[PDB]
Amino acid sequence: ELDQLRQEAEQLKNQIRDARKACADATLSQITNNIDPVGRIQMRTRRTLRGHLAKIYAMHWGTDSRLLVSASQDGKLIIWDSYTTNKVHAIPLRSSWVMTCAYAPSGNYVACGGLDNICSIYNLKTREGNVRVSRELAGHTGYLSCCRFLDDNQIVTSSGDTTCALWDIETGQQTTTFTGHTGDVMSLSLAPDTRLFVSGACDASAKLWDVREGMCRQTFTGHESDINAICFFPNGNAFATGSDDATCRLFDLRADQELMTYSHDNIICGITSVSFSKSGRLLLAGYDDFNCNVWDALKADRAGVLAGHDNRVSCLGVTDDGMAVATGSWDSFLKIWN
Amino acid sequence: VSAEDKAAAERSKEIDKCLSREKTYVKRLVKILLLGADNSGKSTFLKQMRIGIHEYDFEIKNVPFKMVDVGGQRSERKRWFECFDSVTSILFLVDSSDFNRLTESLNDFETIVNNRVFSNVSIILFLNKTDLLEEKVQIVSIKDYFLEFEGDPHCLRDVQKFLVECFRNKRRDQQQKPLYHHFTTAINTENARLIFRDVKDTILHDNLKQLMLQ
């Protein structure tokens, strides 16, 4: 009975591997071996944003490309203007152990969470001129590790109990639960059209999830350690992953394979975050040795470096116009490069 | 610069004033991480000193202290739950009178102190219920569980030295910070002082290296 099921699983794995072998007629390097490079890329620090009291753990951009929210471990969220370096809002949290933050695509709400296993949602536009807790969402049994908005009253979260969940804010009850991972889930990424998302967990594995159904579409493997970051290509047909084995990788959905690996023989530190550019030609990554690297995404060549931080680069972000990049690190400063 | 921009700048300066008000207290606090077992006198230890992830803020002569109790949540192996690398000391509770679980307590001790995140953090070790240890050693010899005991199984000094030396061998070769240990009853009065002196010595030890004197 059980042995027959295990034999069937082995046969299915063999069939999947053979099918993935039969579709690789040529590699990506050969196709893109007759085009110009991007040359050398140089960036300068336009602004520096000061005022957090401790390490910085996350940040997120607004959809107007001017406003920012950042979270620190002193128990504060701050909303900044970036053209003038003015502080628009400051928010104190009830729980000082915070791990992530998000900014709604309309500008009305913010969300956060951490080691308290709860997701908190704050309202920014009231009639009494102050910010107050709109809602608290509970039901996870592990620390919250990511959250992303879909609408004003639909959110998605991932937790360290090996589960993801889609919630309806107006009612306060879970709508969908996504299960199947073996280890803690570390990151999420929403598709441009908001009908799929991807997750990466501490089993050296990534999964593609449908939203309206609740089932797993595809599973991607090939890394050899934990996965800390993930993001989509601009057109929503490929994604990139970053591990603590000091490599990044590019995966494709339709081809269902792995295309290119970004690694250098002089890097022995893990990766904390990744991101793309507006055209998808440059890939940016942040490392544990307080540096950032800009790679040519079609050739796997180092095309630039960003240096100027002091302790460790923990988070990155690119605006919806491709006009600035923001980095945040463990020395409590945020920097804007252009 | 127009008028509304000036008003916004003034608002930003007020927010800055509040943050600089809080910075002074933030930069003066001492954090201590509490760890113990299920049956150790943890609750009585907290209660008789008039003091999820629980917290306890209090004060000695002039210093503000904060004790962080994880409450048995340390089942997270290594991923990125080790975000307590800004503490000054780890304070362990052990039940000496219950010989049958000493091996488990030792394993839990060896699983924590040998982690690279806690490289520059000192360890304080409280051994609790010593009177019950005196009552138990007379009847049940400690030699029936460990074969390395050497001396009279009825003498407190030999067994206490055995326990201390058995806890010390598990540490790493690197010696940057010491290991303090106390034989205190369930509820004593010098516990606050005992922690105070052991933290003062650690801070002085680190200052002696910050001044290039060593």
Epitope: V88, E128, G129 | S2, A3, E4, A8, E10
Partner: single-chain antibody, 232 residues
Amino acid sequence: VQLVESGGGLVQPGGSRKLSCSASGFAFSSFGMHWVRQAPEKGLEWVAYISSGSGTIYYADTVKGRFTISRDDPKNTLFLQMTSLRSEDTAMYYCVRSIYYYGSSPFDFWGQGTTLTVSSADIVMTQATSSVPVTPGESVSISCRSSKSLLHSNGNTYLYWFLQRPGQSPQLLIYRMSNLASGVPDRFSGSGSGTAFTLTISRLEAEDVGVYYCMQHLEYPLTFGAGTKLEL
């Protein structure tokens, strides 16, 4: 949200008086406050400004040296002290709340006013008309002109449109020349250029007869228009 004023009455020339205002329902210590004035059978005009934290204080040229403004934040109260009164100070007085940051709406709530009876580089806003009859079901247009460009180098135009119904305090219709306020039906619209502006109303109905005012906010002092009357 509520602002209640007191301290009105009848005085003699050369006297002194103190007006008080009590606030209830919002964070009084995060807003700055304005004192605004209306003469009998005339238009509005601005009197004084005090900011959040008492950092900055502004007066008008006809009240400098005689009037004084203050706030008490624990008690949630605003005070105006007035001395050396004249026959030109007989009027109704309003208290207004204002908050400034990137994207706000600074003149959204007005008080109810008190009555007092006693025994240049400024920008001029014209509003050359005074009245126009109308009938429900059609559309209406109103236009104003200024003596200086209201457009800045940061891409913003500072123009505000207010409405006042018979027997009631004013309210905000439009801020910064194109933004519709909260709770206002979207029949109203605003547009214009650097020195000529228009407000348009589609499908004119009841509860829209009264006086329409326009105001600038480039630089102190703040100056009002003359106001256009709309009757059915």
